[PDB]
Write a protein that binds this ligand. Structure first.
Ligand SMILES: C[n+]1cnc(N)c2nc[nH]c21
Ligand SMILES: C[n+]1cnc(N)c2nc[nH]c21
Lengths: 542, 543
């Protein structure tokens, strides 16, 4: 029938997550033989025939083999725990094989997690062989230098009933380094580079340990810091100059040396340092942060997430001017974070009671809406929208004016991500996090900009909804991940992101929903709208 | 061209009211000769022509004669004051003539208002013919049907009683003519005249009695005991109240009276105290009751009721039945009136007599299973009565709503009453733009109910439907510019713009629902105590 097609159109588009109708699950089977139509169908297909054990399986592998080629995201689902079978893993891996390197890089983080899934036998035999997914990751790590660095750092962290999963990761990392040694010139070139990175990290850790060990005023500890860096050959490789190393946090950039005098130390109780590095070429300086206190895996997942969303949005050709900095954690309790010149909002307010005066110093225009360049305002509005919607989907907690930073450009971003998926020290939300100052920085509900802001939020939300599947699959693979917040309710953890997505709603409904949350959050923050609500309560009483 | 049609379809649906048309009328004209596509087009076509060239008028006139015939609702615009010219007005009347009596009756109230616009010399000449076109039309029809005669008579009578000076004389002449046509006419015309005479005499005695009751010192009970005695006292008055010669009730000509039961008569709580009455019906003793108010001008409440009745009619046509109750008012001459009495209990009474609304439905209609041990239909009718009213009071700007002021019925329905404050006039400083007591929201089961969600959904569909049918509502309001309805009279012009603004015709539907959703959200948050606290916590989070 022609109508059944609309109901099929329904199933291929709607879920990445359906359990629904393990009775209808075979109606698809009946029309699929002809409607091996397009890519998406196949993932849905595999979910049901597999439940029954045996003769259908052999028929299904043929069916799959002949099926229109799968998109990559299906493959991420195929690598998940749900399907145990090897051929489908093989198929999923051939899809990744088709994927370009940059794509692996984003996905890559989960793929390392994906290794936890079978088969150990595939791992044991490769290991036994020198003394399928794992094999593929290694080969492609060896093809690309940047890829190899990230692969290495992720494995080093996993090795640093989960004891058996550790064991496996250890075997996989060690093989990887061994193939590089046995390597032809370029592999070995990468290998030596990895060894060089590590040595350096270990030296910077040792310096930090010794900086922490002296009790002090913050200034005293910066003074001490500058002296240790300046001081030569007490530390295996001098810090004021060393052989050029490609930054571990960013492979593309090489570093010759740090600069001591430039380094300043952060207000946070456990104190990360800003360091200045020099690029191998043209004496560019790179500024990074080196944090000593906590495991950064959580911050980095969020950052990968943001990156993904921005990418899709830009592929949408909405640039919300998201400013997603790279984060890498070396070990649990050391990491590097990109640094972008920025002022924390609270700082701005101490420096200036208003954000607009703050912009006014940097990009003033006379016919400009407010004494700001029109384009700055637009960029500010967009960055807020993007970030409200992203935090929302991600259910980020603990926002405060120290947490959100502003650039002279107007981009707005969030710095610190200790609380994910709604976890929060405080007892209530708001679900949408906006300072009063930021809404006044928009010029309030009356203003035209604020309306543009709201408008952007909805449309961003609508788009992300469309690419539901990628985010859910990536998360599907963070269950066993060791992010503190996932670990508490891991099973539940995937559902929370999907709840925020509200995929159940038709679009108009979805926009309405987000409008709702916007209204609550804005009214709460503004003092004038709170007073108006009180007059309305007042009205029914008498 | 191909798109031009679309700009024009946009012009045709969107407003009936707009002065918007400026260049558009000139481009539209070129197309008028080629396509009188639609009935709607005719109203749009009419707008451009008359002021300028007189010959231009001849061309437009020929155009209209063969033009796709106008819908009755649009015709009303024509009787409206903005269009002076005699030939178009004749056309409006011809369109009304085709209309069936019931639709004709619903509008009847406005026509009397419209009567003001037709030139008096047209009316003076008709008077001239009898004593030693629309006005003729109203009388001709008023005569053909008794119920129409009755309504026409009461509306005119209210108007006749002492700028106003010229309009009073006009109405008086029309009435005198209508009465002379009936006495003169045949049997039915005479029959109508006789029944009208009975109605008139009956009310007057009814009024004498109410006046005696009011003088008497005492609280309500002392006064009701007194009222009970007078009806029962035969022969104090011209009419004997315990029995009479049957009279068509002014509220329903369809039903005669014949009796009143003194014992059944009560009075209400409200400030000037209306009696209930009962009568027998002319047939098999079935009672009727109505109310009867001694203390103000009902005109405003009747317009509002006409408005609610019509809106309900439109929604039923769509097939939304929100179980509205559009009870009947007529005024008599201002300061008496009647109102149909529907059995109901005011919410405040319901809360005191039974702790909460849920308990109240539960006692009358209890089914252990669903949803609240309250039979489902009742819940559904309560949800629907609720949606229909917030939307309708909101469009109409009904204000001064209180618990004393809404009612329930055993059946579930909710409705309003006593529309003294209209069009955003309020005795208080604020809205809320939507009127929901907490008591009512709890009745729904609060924010997450299938039922509360159901109510919001019902409101949205209702809003959109009314949005589509805006043309009729605006035309009727335009017709009561000169209304002598207090709230409208404060600024006559603003009244029409205010109902229109509430309408949100500019917005796209997706936006319109967002706009309505917004108004509902502030209104419910302020009403519920938990939500206010949630907001306080959110304020607390930041600073
Ligand atoms: C400027 N900046 C950028 N990224 C961070 N993670 C950060 N923390 C403090 N300041 C910061
Ligand atoms: C109780 N009651 C019922 N129906 C009415 N129309 C009315 N008006 C005031 N009170 C009322």
């Amino acid at each position: 029938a022609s109508i059944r097609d609309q109901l099929h159109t329904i199933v291929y588009r709607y879920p990445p997550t359906y359990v629904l109708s393990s009775e209808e699950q075979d109606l698809v089977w009946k029309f699929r033989f002809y409607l091996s139509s397009h890519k998406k169908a196949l993932t849905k297909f595999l979910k049901c025939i597999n439940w029954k054990l045996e003769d259908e399986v052999t028929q299904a592998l043929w069916m799959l083999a002949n099926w229109a080629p799968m998109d990559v995201e299906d493959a991420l689902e195929l690598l998940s725990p749900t399907f145990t079978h090897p051929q489908v893993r093989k198929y999923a891996v051939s899809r990744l094989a088709q994927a370009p390197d940059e794509d692996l890089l984003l996905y890559l983080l989960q793929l390392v997690q994906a290794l936890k899934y079978e088969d150990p036998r595939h791992i044991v035999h490769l290991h036994g062989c020198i003394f399928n997914l794992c094999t593929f990751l290694i080969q492609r790590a060896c093809t690309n230098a940047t890829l190899a660095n990230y692969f290495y750092w992720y494995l080093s962290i996993e090795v640093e009933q989960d004891e058996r999963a550790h064991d496996m990761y250890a075997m996989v990392l060690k093989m990887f380094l061994k193939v590089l040694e046995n390597g032809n010139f370029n592999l070995r070139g990468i290998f030596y580079n990895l060894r060089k990175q590590r040595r350096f990290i270990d030296e910077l850790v040792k310096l930090v340990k010794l900086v922490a060990k002296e009790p002090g005023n913050r200034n005293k500890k910066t003074e001490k810091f500058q002296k240790l860096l300046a001081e030569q050959d007490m530390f295996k490789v001098n810090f004021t100059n060393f052989e050029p190393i490609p930054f571990p946090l960013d492979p593309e950039i090489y570093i010759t040396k740090i600069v001591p005098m430039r380094t300043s130390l952060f207000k946070s109780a456990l104190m990360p340092a800003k360091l200045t590095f020099v690029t191998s070429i043209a004496h560019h300086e790179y500024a990074a942060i080196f944090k000593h206190g906590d495991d950064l895996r959580q911050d980095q997942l969020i950052l990968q997430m943001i990156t993904l969303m921005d990418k899709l949005l830009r592929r949408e050709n909405l640039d919300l001017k998201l400013t997603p900095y790279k984060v890498l954690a070396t070990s649990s309790k050391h990491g590097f974070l990109q640094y972008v010149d920025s002022c924390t909002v609270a700082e701005v307010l101490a420096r200036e009671g208003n954000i607009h005066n703050f912009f006014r110093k940097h990009h003033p225009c006379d016919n400009g809406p407010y004494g700001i360049s029109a384009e700055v305002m637009d960029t500010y509005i967009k960055s807020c929208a993007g970030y409200c919607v992203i935090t929302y989907l991600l259910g980020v907690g603990d926002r405060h004016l120290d947490n959100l930073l502003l650039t002279t450009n107007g981009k707005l971003f969030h710095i610190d991500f200790g609380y994910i998926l709604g976890r929060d020290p405080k007892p209530m939300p708001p679900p949408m996090k906006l300072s009063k100052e930021m809404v006044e920085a928009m010029g309030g509900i009356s203003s035209e900009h604020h309306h543009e802001f709201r408008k952007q939020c909805y449309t961003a939300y609508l788009h992300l909804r469309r690419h539901a599947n990628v985010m859910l699959n990536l998360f599907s693979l963070m269950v066993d991940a060791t992010v503190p917040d996932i670990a508490l309710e891991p099973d539940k953890a995937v559902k929370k992101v999907e709840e925020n997505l509200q995929l159940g709603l038709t679009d108009e409904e979805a926009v309405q929903h987000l409008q709702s949350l916007l209204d609550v959050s804005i009214t709460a923050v503004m003092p004038a709208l709170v007073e108006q609500i009180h007059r309305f309560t007042q009205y029914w009483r008498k």
